[PDB]
Amino acid sequence: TFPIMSNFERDFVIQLVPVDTEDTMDQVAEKCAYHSINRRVHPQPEKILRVRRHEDGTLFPRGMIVSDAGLRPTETLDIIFMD
């Protein structure tokens, strides 16, 4: 358990999303979408949800876990659309 701030692509607002220290970027992404997709952002299923540290554009590989990301509690992360 680990809070992060979710900056979801094409949404107007940063939100608080509790994640797990053991989640994959993929599973972070999916926890974030829950609060964005079909609320304020149209799904994109030609697309793949990716995670980059907000402060400096660093893109995290899909399957890296939070534990290893070296995040600061409450750190802000872009949840973006790629392929």
Binding site: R10, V13, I14, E55
Partner: peptide, 19 residues
């Protein structure tokens, strides 16, 4: 106040964080 800015086709929401 909520951190919020432009959504949609020209997304530009930013957080000016500080440690």
């Amino acid at each position: 106040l909520p951190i919020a800015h432009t959504p949609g086709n020209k997304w530009n929401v930013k957080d000016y964080q500080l440690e």
